[PDB]
Amino acid sequence: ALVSVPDLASLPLLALSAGGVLASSVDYLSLAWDNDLDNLDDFQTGDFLRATK
């Protein structure tokens, strides 16, 4: 997917925007594990998150 993050974002919204690129319901806890997030709010308004399946 390679989803960009917007300003004022959140991982349930970043999973809906990654679940529309893949159409596979990408279940936000797997996003923070695949990208090595620290605390579920780690992205900083302009960095990318990679979503596979």
Binding site: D27, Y28, L29, A32, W33, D36, D38, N39, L40, D41, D42
Partner: protein
């Protein structure tokens, strides 16, 4: 990644947590808080706190190599708490001076250490020593020999147990016992003579095997067997002659399936006829078995390999035919030397840690709050700020304790608290200036209720007890035990005694043996930490302690 995340992934993902909270409030209340849709405000507050709790749980999974990294230290543990510095190895007190000394050829064989033989006392017991230098007895030591002697002297200074330092060193002179044999071969030169020189030289001194630790654990043993004796900077010994005696010893080879079987190994040569072309070292009666008695001074071979290449050779190699030998065997075809060095163990840290916290009030949608501080809100929109303050700090204490577990489970440098406590807000965040004129007051409440209070201690707050519980649990790693509670000492110096007793565990293994003059003889500080004193007994610089 020992990380818990595929193990707890079906317990931290906010639907399990929300149904656990929702059934909880359905059980506690239930005819007072009847509507639970997403339109009641308290439902939204509780589920936002649930999201922050799930954040806090997700932080508390990954990973054990990542939770424990401090911020800046390269390794999780100090490298002195690694193996071969902890009490797996030792400093030498057995015969192992031998294996303490058979590694210093990098800047020789057969150390013999013993005691004085029931006489030669000082008449009001010490040790004697015995070395053969073989490859230090060279042309490269008419003056370097004295430097090697004083390095041996400071070695013996470095290894001196509780009493009775050694008294005699006994440099041991050669005998140049060089035999003569003839061999015979079939096909293909100057390499077989070099190997015959190597086998006949290595037959004199007994055995020296130096393995890398991964070379040895591939042979099929464990680290409690590998990390046994000295700190070997080179290899790992296992040999136990002691070829040196006191009656000279018969030195003897050479049977059909024994000592003469290490001569036909060279992959060119047939059978032999061996002679002893010298008269200084005697031969016992019986030459078809051929033992050759030495008398307390060690044998060498021919000396130089050009002394193996006279007009009178000592190993003619017939083919049918002169079979001459040049100096090709001496410079090359003869080198079999490697060197081993150990960095003694390193693990690696990561530090994916944090100081970030998001309060509940900015999880909430933009119709309640996030309004600027104490200017626009009207003393009831501040009431929900105070409603969310204990919940925010209870959610923040998990973050605070989480970011102190590498120094709560610390050996050397330990902190001055029991758990973590952090003020959950930041400058350029609205909820600090709203809580401002009591902000210093209440964070002082939660800080003193988590520290151990360095001066006259917490009397009924068992933080002083809980720190000793930490010390008990960590000292239980090293086979030790926390010193008992003094009913008659001061508290803080006893606590500093106990934490310094924890902080030097691998150092406190060595100084039972080998008292160096430049410390407090840490057997003494072992005793001085078994009962709590720590006047000077740690941080070893000053004098005036409790004297033995």
């Amino acid at each position: 990644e020992n990380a818990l995340f595929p193990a707890v992934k079906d317990a931290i993902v906010f639907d399990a947590l929300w149904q656990q909270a929702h059934e909880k409030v359905t059980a506690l209340s239930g005819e007072i808080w009847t509507d639970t849709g997403d339109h009641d405000p308290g439902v939204t507050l509780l589920q936002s706190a649930t999201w922050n709790c799930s954040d806090l749980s997700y932080r508390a999974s990954l990973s054990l190599n990542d939770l424990l990294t401090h911020q800046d230290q390269s390794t999780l543990f100090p490298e002195e708490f690694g193996p071969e510095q902890v009490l797996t190895c030792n400093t030498v007190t057995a015969e192992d001076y031998r294996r303490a000394l058979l590694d210093v050829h990098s800047s020789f064989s057969d150390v013999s250490l013993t005691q004085e033989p029931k006489e030669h006392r000082f008449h009001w017991g010490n040790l004697w020593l015995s070395l053969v230098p073989t490859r230090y007895t060279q042309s490269l030591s008419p003056e370097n020999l004295a430097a090697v002697e004083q390095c041996l002297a400071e070695f013996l200074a470095a290894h001196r147990n509780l009493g009775e330092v050694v008294s005699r060193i006994t440099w041991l002179q050669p005998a140049t016992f060089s035999p003569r044999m003839t061999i015979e071969l079939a096909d293909n030169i100057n390499q077989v003579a070099a190997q015959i020189y190597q086998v006949t030289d290595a037959f004199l001194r007994p055995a020296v095997a130096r393995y890398t630790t991964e070379q040895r654990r591939a042979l099929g043993d464990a680290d409690d067997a590998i990390f046994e004796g000295p700190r070997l900077k080179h290899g790992w010994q296992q040999t136990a002659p002691s070829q040196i005696t006191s009656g000279g010893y018969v030195l003897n080879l050479g049977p059909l399936v024994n000592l003469l079987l290490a001569i036909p190994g060279v992959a060119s040569l047939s059978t032999l006829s061996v002679d002893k072309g010298d008269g200084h070292i005697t031969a016992v009666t019986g030459d078809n078995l051929r033992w050759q008695v030495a008398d307390g001074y060690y044998p060498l071979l021919w000396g130089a390999p050009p002394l193996s290449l006279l007009a009178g050779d000592d190993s003619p190699l017939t083919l049918v035919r002169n079979t001459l030998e040049s100096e090709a065997m001496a410079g090359y075809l003869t080198q079999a030397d490697l060197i081993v060095t150990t960095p003694t163990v390193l693990p690696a840290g990561r530090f994916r840690d944090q100081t970030l916290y998001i309060p509940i009030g900015q999880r909430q949608p933009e119709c309640y709050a996030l309004q600027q501080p104490d200017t626009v809100i009207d003393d009831q929109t501040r009431a929900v700020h105070q409603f969310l303050l204990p919940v925010d700090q209870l959610l923040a204490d998990g973050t605070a304790e989480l970011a102190q577990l590498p120094t709560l489970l610390a050996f050397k440098n330990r902190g001055d608290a029991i758990r973590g406590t952090r003020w959950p807000y930041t400058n350029a965040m609205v909820q600090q200036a709203i809580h401002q004129p009591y902000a210093k007051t209440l964070e002082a409440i939660a800080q003193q209720d988590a520290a151990i209070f360095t001066q006259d201690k917490q009397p009924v707050g068992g933080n002083y007890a809980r720190e000793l519980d930490f010390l008990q649990y960590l000292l239980g790693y090293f086979g030790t035990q926390r010193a008992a509670l003094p009913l008659t000492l001061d508290l803080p110096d006893f606590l500093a005694t106990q934490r310094a007793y924890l902080a030097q565990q691998p150092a406190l293994g060595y100084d039972r043996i080998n008292i160096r003059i430049d410390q407090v003889s840490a057997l003494q500080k072992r005793i001085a930490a078994r009962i709590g004193l720590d006047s000077i007994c740690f941080a070893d610089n000053p004098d005036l302690g409790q004297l033995p």
